[PDB]
Amino acid sequence: TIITLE
Amino acid sequence: TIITLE
Amino acid sequence: TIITLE
Amino acid sequence: TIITLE
Amino acid sequence: TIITLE
Amino acid sequence: TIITLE
Ligand SMILES: [Zn+2]
Ligand SMILES: [Zn+2]
Ligand SMILES: [Zn+2]
Ligand SMILES: [Zn+2]
Ligand SMILES: [Zn+2]
Ligand SMILES: [Zn+2]
């Protein structure tokens, strides 16, 4: 699982 | 699962 | 699992 | 922002 | 921001 | 910011 917030 | 918010 | 906030 | 995975 | 994985 | 993994 990948969760990314830039 | 990939969740991305830029 | 990867969680990233820049 | 809310991201939830159960 | 809330990120939750159960 | 809250990050929770149970
Ligand atoms: Zn993954
Ligand atoms: Zn995936
Ligand atoms: Zn991983
Ligand atoms: Zn919110
Ligand atoms: Zn918040
Ligand atoms: Zn907070």
UniProtKB/Swiss-Prot annotation, chains A, B, C, D, E, F:
Effect of I2V: In sporadic cancers; somatic mutation
Description of what induces expression: Up-regulated in response to DNA damage. Isoform 2 is not induced in tumor cells in response to stress.
Phenotype when changing L5V: In sporadic cancers; somatic mutation
Effect of L5P: In sporadic cancers; somatic mutation
Protein function: Multifunctional transcription factor that induces cell cycle arrest, DNA repair or apoptosis upon binding to its target DNA sequence. Acts as a tumor suppressor in many tumor types; induces growth arrest or apoptosis depending on the physiological circumstances and cell type. Negatively regulates cell division by controlling expression of a set of genes required for this process. One of the activated genes is an inhibitor of cyclin-dependent kinases. Apoptosis induction seems to be mediated either by stimulation of BAX and FAS antigen expression, or by repression of Bcl-2 expression.
Family of this protein: Belongs to the p53 family.
Disease per record: TP53 is found in increased amounts in a wide variety of transformed cells. TP53 is frequently mutated or inactivated in about 60% of cancers. TP53 defects are found in Barrett metaplasia a condition in which the normally stratified squamous epithelium of the lower esophagus is replaced by a metaplastic columnar epithelium. The condition develops as a complication in approximately 10% of patients with chronic gastroesophageal reflux disease and predisposes to the development of esophageal adenocarcinoma. Esophageal cancer: A malignancy of the esophagus. The most common types are esophageal squamous cell carcinoma and adenocarcinoma. Cancer of the esophagus remains a devastating disease because it is usually not detected until it has progressed to an advanced incurable stage.
Name of the protein in its database record: Cellular tumor antigen p53
Source species of the chain: Homo sapiens (Human)
Organism taxonomic ancestry: Eukaryota, Metazoa, Chordata, Craniata, Vertebrata
